[PDB]
Nucleic acid binder design. Structure first.
Ligand SMILES: [Mg+2]
Ligand SMILES: [Zn+2]
Ligand SMILES: [Zn+2]
Ligand SMILES: [Zn+2]
Lengths: 63, 263, 45, 66, 137, 113, 49
RNA sequence: UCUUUUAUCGAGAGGU
């Protein structure tokens, strides 16, 4: 891979998609592509807007 | 200058005659009541377990259409102006449901009254689903046969009737004006007679019938209006009306603010 | 290894890919995989 | 398949008028009077309940695969 | 010219709204006495000519589980073919169609006629009317 | 697959003014106002009211395409008055009317119960 | 593809030389093309699918 | 710094 958060499950904490589950489909740089679970669409979102799941709860981009 | 004359008033519907105003103010009031009365409704569903004979989004749809009580919904903030992460307490109401069948003979009916409010910002009057009486069971969500557990957890957020037709408070609103046809704003189809081939609108006695020796005036305008408002229990009609007028006033005040600060 | 359910006796078990295809109970020969263990959201819309 | 919740044209909730409708059909009432007693005057909410096809009755008799 | 005007609120409340299933199938062909094909997950070290979509949604025996969302070209059945005599296996997968977005519904696993494995998958999705769909009286 | 997100019918992005004004040139003392994220409700409620003051000569509006969200409005008074002030006056008047209506409705309700 | 590009526009089966005409582009949402109805006469077209 | 795979022949059911 070319990053450590691809394909990992994510929760969105800002924006119109707040509270929605997703998966990091592509994280080239700063602007990520999260594949939302709820409707069949992959959205552009800033990496600042995401919580990643880790060993203990949803951590911000410090994982 | 405006006037009001309530003809029928009760719990969840009003029938009134709105008089001595303009037209697009009453019409804009109607559209405002059908389009912008911010209410509350279920928004997210996280199904923990489903083993019934119904696909998920079918259930999540039916839950998506359930009326909840929202008297104090003009204080809770929207979902986009809370600075927390995921959700907190000043932005949603959390419900949970858990039902199972037990035995070999039987067909348990999972209703809507079995929804239990868990956590919400207090102490405000939200969350609880609308109940008709003191015994009534309400909406019929699902059915369960032998060994079919169902357990789910739902989020509930605030919205208006422009983002989805579920946050809408009123059903249908009756509206009319000028029953005897005096302004000649319309024309009537007929085969033999245009009088013995049409119904009489329930209000053709409140105004007087025109004289057959009358000429045609040409300065009058639609003046006396007749409207009737229903609800689904999520609100009560007087609150719908007052909140509508309040929202319209806030809109005009916003536009005036833009015009003033744009200087 | 992973959960598997029989077609008939409704009996759960697990496999390590080494067994042949039947339940340890009645031995019915059309087995279904079980639900997964993640979390599934929706929109209610 | 199963009774809807809202209506389709206006939105008057008709998800709690199926049990009373069946029970009033056991007592020998008529559909016109069984709807005149459930308070349904606009014929959209009337057609919503008069022409429903209840299918879940079948969908249960197939033994559970789970 | 035979077009119409449909209401949005009725579409929202559930008018003309439909479910849409689909199913896939794959089995195991035998070539040698001991040379067969095994459902599994290929890794980059051993197999060759991998396809592009993510392989991270397969469990360990090569069959994706129900409850997982699958979109464009997500690999659902990883199957390998052994190379005729390191780096000694060739990929023979089965990807989801390049124009579908669905939730996996039900997976089936049984034996064939000869005596080897035999898998089916069943995906489903929801469809709603919009500007372009056809209707008829 | 190609659907506009619904909330875009009433949530304003950052780089879009809620209101923009441009003066027309073919005739003097006439201006063009451009409203974002508004429909027939505000536009009509303003139009029927401005179309009454004995000093505004031509007022109109239109919605260009119903799939987007905006409308444009043409306003022309006479030489003495500047149109912006007149628009503000109309807003104030309408607000007053709504207030009175709410008051009398509440009185009639508390009497009728 | 952006606003005001000239694209060729065609329907099968083309007969007389009016069934292939270049229109100006205009980006719109949703999933279908758009025509002004006055150009339904050389194309022998109708919106019935 | 890219790239990145869709057999073949034949038969049938359909849409303007
Ligand atoms: Mg045609
Ligand atoms: Zn919050
Ligand atoms: Zn068994
Ligand atoms: Zn109705």
């Amino acid at each position: 891979g070319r990053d450590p958060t691809l394909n990992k499950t994510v929760k969105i904490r800002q924006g119109g998609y707040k509270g929605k589950i997703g998966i990091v489909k592509e994280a080239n740089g700063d602007r990520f592509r999260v594949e939302l679970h709820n409707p069949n669409k992959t959205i552009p979102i800033p990496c600042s807007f995401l919580l990643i799941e880790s060993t203990h709860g949803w951590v911000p981009y410090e994982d | 200058e405006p006037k009001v004359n309530i003809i029928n008033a009760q719990d969840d519907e009003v029938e009134l005659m709105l008089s001595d105003v303009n037209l697009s103010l009453a019409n804009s009031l109607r559209r405002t009541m059908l389009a912008e009365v911010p209410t509350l409704a279920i928004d997210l569903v996280e199904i923990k377990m489903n083993t019934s004979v119904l696909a998920d989004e079918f259930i999540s749809h039916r839950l998506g259409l359930i009326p909840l009580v929202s008297e104090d919904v003009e204080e809770m903030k929207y979902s986009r102006d809370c600075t927390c992460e995921d959700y907190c307490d000043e932005c949603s109401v959390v419900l949970e449901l858990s039902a199972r069948h037990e035995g070999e003979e039987g067909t348990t009916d999972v209703y809507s009254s079995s929804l239990i409010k868990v956590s919400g910002p207090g102490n405000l009057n939200v969350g609880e689903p609308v109940r008709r009486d003191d015994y009534d069971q309400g909406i019929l969500l699902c059915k369960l046969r032998n060994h079919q557990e169902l357990n789910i957890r739902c989020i509930a957020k605030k919205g208006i009737a422009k983002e989805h037709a579920k946050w809408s408070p009123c059903s249908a609103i009756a509206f009319e004006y000028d029953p005897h046809n005096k302004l000649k704003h319309t024309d009537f189809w007929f085969e033999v007679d245009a009088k013995k081939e049409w119904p009489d609108s329930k209000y053709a006695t409140w105004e007087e019938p025109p004289k057959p020796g009358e000429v045609f005036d040409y300065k009058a305008k639609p003046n006396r209006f007749y409207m009737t408002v229903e609800t689904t229990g999520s609100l009560k009609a007087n609150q719908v009306f007052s909140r509508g007028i309040k929202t319209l006033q806030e809109k005009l005040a916003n536009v005036l603010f833009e015009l003033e600060n744009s200087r | 290894g992973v959960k598997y359910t029989c077609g008939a006796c409704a009996h759960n078990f697990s496999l390590n890919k080494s067994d042949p295809v039947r339940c340890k109970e009645c031995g019915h020969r059309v087995i279904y995989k079980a639900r997964t263990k993640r979390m599934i959201q929706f929109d209610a819309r | 398949m199963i009774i809807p919740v809202r209506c389709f044209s206006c939105g008057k909730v008709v998800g709690d008028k199926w049990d009373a409708y069946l029970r009033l059909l056991e007592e020998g009432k008529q559909e016109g009077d069984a709807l005149d007693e459930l308070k349904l005057k606009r014929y959209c909410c009337r057609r919503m309940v008069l022409t429903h096809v209840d299918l879940i009755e079948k969908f249960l008799r197939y033994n559970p695969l789970e | 010219e035979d077009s119409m005007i449909m209401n949005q609120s009725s579409i929202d409340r559930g008018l003309f709204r439909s479910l849409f299933f689909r199913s896939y199938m794959d089995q195991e062909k035998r070539f040698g006495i001991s040379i067969v094909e095994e459902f599994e997950k290929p890794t980059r070290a051993t197999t060759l000519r991998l396809k592009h979509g993510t392989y991270e949604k397969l469990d360990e025996d090569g069959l994706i589980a129900p409850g997982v969302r699958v979109s464009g070209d997500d690999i659902i059945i990883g199957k390998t073919t052994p190379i005729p005599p390191y780096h000694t296996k060739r990929d023979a997968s089965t990807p989801l169609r390049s124009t579908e977005n669905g939730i996996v519904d039900q997976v089936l696993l049984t034996t064939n006629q000869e005596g080897l494995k035999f898998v089916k998958v069943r995906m489903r999705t929801t469809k709603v009317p919009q500007i372009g769909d056809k209707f008829a009286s | 697959m190609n659907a506009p997100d619904r909330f875009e019918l009433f949530i304003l992005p950052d780089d879009v003014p809620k209101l923009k004004i441009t003066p027309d040139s073919r005739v003097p003392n006439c201006i063009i106002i451009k409203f974002e994220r508004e429909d027939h409700t505000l536009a009509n409620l303003l139009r029927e009211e401005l179309a009454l003051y004995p000093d505004v000569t031509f007022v109109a509006y239109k919605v260009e395409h119903p799939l987007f969200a905006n409308f444009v409005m043409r306003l022309q008074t006479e030489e003495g008055t500047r149109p912006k002030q007149a628009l503000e006056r109309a807003c104030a008047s309408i607000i007053n009317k709504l207030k009175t209506l709410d008051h009398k409705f509440n009185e009639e309700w508390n009497i009728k119960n | 593809l952006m606003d005001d590009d000239p694209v060729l526009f065609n329907r099968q089966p083309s007969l007389h030389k009016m069934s292939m005409m270049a229109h100006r582009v205009k980006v719109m949402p949703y999933s279908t093309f758009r025509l002004n109805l006055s150009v339904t006469s050389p194309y022998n077209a109708d919106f019935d699918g």
